[PDB]
């Protein structure tokens, strides 16, 4: 009873009677909205959130989703939509909820993994500094050791009083945390009963308080929270635990990260940017080398382009020497190096341009200016050096604008091709599947891990059973190919695994499910309606802006377009020993066929192409393969289709 | 096992919910059609009665019907066939 029709209610809404906020809270409770940043590069660009009323006029947004949205707070605006139907509210509530989308569609890594402030706070909270206050010493002569605590709460009171620094080494006795696997298994009979455990650990207080954020079922960590270590931790949490525990853990991690981001004291002072004391002598010696090169060109002993290249090599080596001297000069408590060394953000080269040397700045064309900028940004540039730097700055901004436009076009083409590949069947049940390399060994006898296992061999359903010299069938047909089975096959030593894939899915209408393997968004198997074409197109087209440019994004763009490469490195057509021969401005390399066939002539092999080194360098009379690349460079896809099937 | 208590829109936990359905799409349409039935029952409460059953869970004070359907699915009082 606040209006006798909808018209009285409408004028109540316009005239804003103060009960309407209570009614608004009533209608808002459990009613998710959609959020949306400007251009939606990928599927995580639209999420769903339960709203809550906030004074002011700006959308308060949770800080852990700005990584997924790619939305910094420099004045960027986000649109808000709203579902109305019961079906639409269910779709937004279960599917597009924020906590349900933590992992990538691309690589399955968590995108809600914390960053700059949270990562720096956790890094300060989990680093260990020796000689800190309240440190455990094992010194027990007349005095005892004075470094042990029965409880982390006792340690907390000892830190609240000015006794314990949180990064000091201590020996507490934890009763509510799982010890790491060694101490647990050696302490009792594999029943890691961390409710009833009672065990000691020589750690920091900070790592104890940090592992209090993690679940009880998780073991202890006892490490220093680099960003890669936190990525591995949230990966293990997501692939082992339900996603709600991952969401609550990530939320607790954010709060502790901010609370220790304040206390970390990472400021920036002009005294906190130190220049190396032996910088000037380094620049003096390399200036002597540069002056010798300049005198050598002044004699006419070499050409102008070659002395440009000589100065380029000299100043690149000089810049790298400056970077090494700065690396050894800085201590780790320096906040500028602490930010990078945590892995919060930034490369070392930003610190090198801050203090040290700017280096070599590019031409407008892309060439290198032979005069290096020998002054740091802390020392202040001069006018000509600023005029030199402006070229690269302007070209970088123009490249960024063109790159986001071209990435939009590439995603347009990819969505318009792959929009009709959805999962339609549970199993096409062929045996046809590709073979994956999966950690080819070392000649000393070591099954050394291939780098691109987590991009290729992960998350796929095995079409073949895994057997070890027909001993034990170690992994059956149709396992997910996650971590422990990969470790098992690595221990077994077998490498080539004929896994199923969508390149050989026997279903016609789209692809089946087992040939698609594990969904990256869930970690479970893909459901039977998920449009993996659009997921694939968005995951390919999204990070193209970070592609830094024959090679680069146009090279990627022509690669899908099946274009002819301009640096068309040739291939063999048959086996046999080569007739390597170099003509006049372009080479004339023939190949003796090993079979009954003709001596295959290759005519236009220009001087910019080089002999492919493989196995040692290419030589004349080297026995070639069927479709082995003649020169090292870009092979066309159309003829390598026509050769190698 | 012992994880936490949820609150707000994530109650009941959907990872627990997905033990009770094949796909999450089936979960979506499950909850949606139950919510349409609950909403029509609330519309049919002013008029006479028919077989449109009410909220099998004792609902909240002022609850959205979708949440009642979600808690009903989590309580496993319902049953469903695919297409």
């Amino acid at each position: 009873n606040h209006a006798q029709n909808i018209k009285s209610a409408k004028r109540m809404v316009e005239r804003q009677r103060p009960q309407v906020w209570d009614v608004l809270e009533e209608v808002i409770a459990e009613h998710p909205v959609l959020l949306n940043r400007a251009p939606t590069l990928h599927r995580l660009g639209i999420q769903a959130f339960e709203p809550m009323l906030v004074e002011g006029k700006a959308i308060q947004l949770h800080p852990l989703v700005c990584e997924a949205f790619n939305a910094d707070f420099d004045g960027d605006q986000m649109a808000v939509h709203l579902p109305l139907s019961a079906e639409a509210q269910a779709e937004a509530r279960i599917l597009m909820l924020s906590s349900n989308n933590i992992l990538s569609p691309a690589s399955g890594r968590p995108l809600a993994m914390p960053r700059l402030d949270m990562v720096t706070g956790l890094y300060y909270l989990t680093t260990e500094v020796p000689g800190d206050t309240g440190e455990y010493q094992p010194a027990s002569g007349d005095h005892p050791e004075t470094g042990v605590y029965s409880s982390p709460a006792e340690a907390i009171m000892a830190a609240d009083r000015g006794v314990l620094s949180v990064r000091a080494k201590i020996k507490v006795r934890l009763t509510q945390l799982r010890p790491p696997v060694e101490i647990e298994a050696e302490l009792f009979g594999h029943s890691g009963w961390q409710p009833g455990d009672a065990w000691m650990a020589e750690t920091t207080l900070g790592r104890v308080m940090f592992n209090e954020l993690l679940p009880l079922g998780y073991p202890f960590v006892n490490k220093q929270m680099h960003k890669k270590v936190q990525a591995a931790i949230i990966n293990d949490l997501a692939e082992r635990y339900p996603m709600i525990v991952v969401a609550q853990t990530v939320d607790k991690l954010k709060d502790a990260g901010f609370y220790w981001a304040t206390r970390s004291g990472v400021t920036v002072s002009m005294a906190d940017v130190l220049v190396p004391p032996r910088k000037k002598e380094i620049l003096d010696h390399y200036e002597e080398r540069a002056d010798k090169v300049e005198k050598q060109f002044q004699r006419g002993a070499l050409n102008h382009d070659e002395r440009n290249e000589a100065l380029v090599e000299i100043w690149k080596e000089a810049t790298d020497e400056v970077g090494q001297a700065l690396r050894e000069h800085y201590p780790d408590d320096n906040p500028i190096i602490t930010i990078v060394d945590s892995g919060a953000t930034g490369n070392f080269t930003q610190t090198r341009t801050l203090a040290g040397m700017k280096g070599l700045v590019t031409n407008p064309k892309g060439e290198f200016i032979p005069r290096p900028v020998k002054s740091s940004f802390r020392e202040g540039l001069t006018v000509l050096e600023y005029f030199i730097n402006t070229h690269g700055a302007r070209k970088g901004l123009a490249d960024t604008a063109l790159r986001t436009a071209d990435s939009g076009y590439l995603t347009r083409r990819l969505v318009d091709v792959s929009q009709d590949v959805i999962v339609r069947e549970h199993d096409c049940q062929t045996e046809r599947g590709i073979v994956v390399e999966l950690a080819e060994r070392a000649p000393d006898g070591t099954l050394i891990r291939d780098p691109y296992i987590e991009t290729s061999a992960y998350a796929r359903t095995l079409g073949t059973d895994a057997v070890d010299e027909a001993g034990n069938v170690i992994v059956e047909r149709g396992q997910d190919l996650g971590d422990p089975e990969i470790d098992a096959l690595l221990a077994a030593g077998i490498t080539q695994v004929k896994v199923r894939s969508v390149l050989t899915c026997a279903t016609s209408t789209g692809v089946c499910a087992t040939c698609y393997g594990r969904s990256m968004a869930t970690g479970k198997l893909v459901d039977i309606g998920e449009a993996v074409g659009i997921v694939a197109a968005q995951s390919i087209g999204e990070p193209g802006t970070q592609l830094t440019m024959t090679g680069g994004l146009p090279r990627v763009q022509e690669l899908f377009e099946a274009r002819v490469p301009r640096g068309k490195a040739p291939i063999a057509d048959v086996t046999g020993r080569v007739r390597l021969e170099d003509g006049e401005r372009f080479y004339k390399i023939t190949i003796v066929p090993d079979d009954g066939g003709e001596e295959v002539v290759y005519d236009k092999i220009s001087k910019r192409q080089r002999l492919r080194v493989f196995k040692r360098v290419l030589s004349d009379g080297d026995h070639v393969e069927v479709g082995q690349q003649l020169m090292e460079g870009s092979a066309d896809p159309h003829e390598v289709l026509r050769v190698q099937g | 096992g012992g994880y936490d208590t949820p609150l707000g829109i994530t109650n009941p936990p959907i990872d627990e919910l997905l033990d009770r359905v094949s796909s999450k799409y089936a979960l979506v349409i499950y909850a949606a059609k139950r919510a349409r039935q609950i909403n029509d029952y609330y519309n049919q409460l002013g008029e006479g009665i028919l077989e449109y059953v009410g909220p099998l869970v004792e609902p909240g004070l002022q609850e959205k019907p979708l949440s009642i359907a979600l808690r009903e699915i989590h309580a496993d009082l319902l049953e469903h066939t695919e297409g």
């Binding site: 079906e87 779709e91 959805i422 459901d527 039977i528 309606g529 998920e530 449009a531 | 796909s23 799409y25 089936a26 979506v28 349409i29 499950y30 059609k33 139950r34 039935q37 059953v53 009410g54 099998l56 009903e72 009082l77 319902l78 049953e79 469903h80 066939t81 695919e82 297409g83």
Partner: peptide
């Protein structure tokens, strides 16, 4: 026809258990 729109998911009949109808 992708996700919720496909015919295996769109045509779900939803009705409570007959035990639950005996609960009220």
């Amino acid at each position: 026809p992708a996700g919720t729109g496909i015919n295996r998911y769109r045509n779900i009949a939803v009705q409570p258990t007959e035990e639950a109808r005996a609960a009220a």
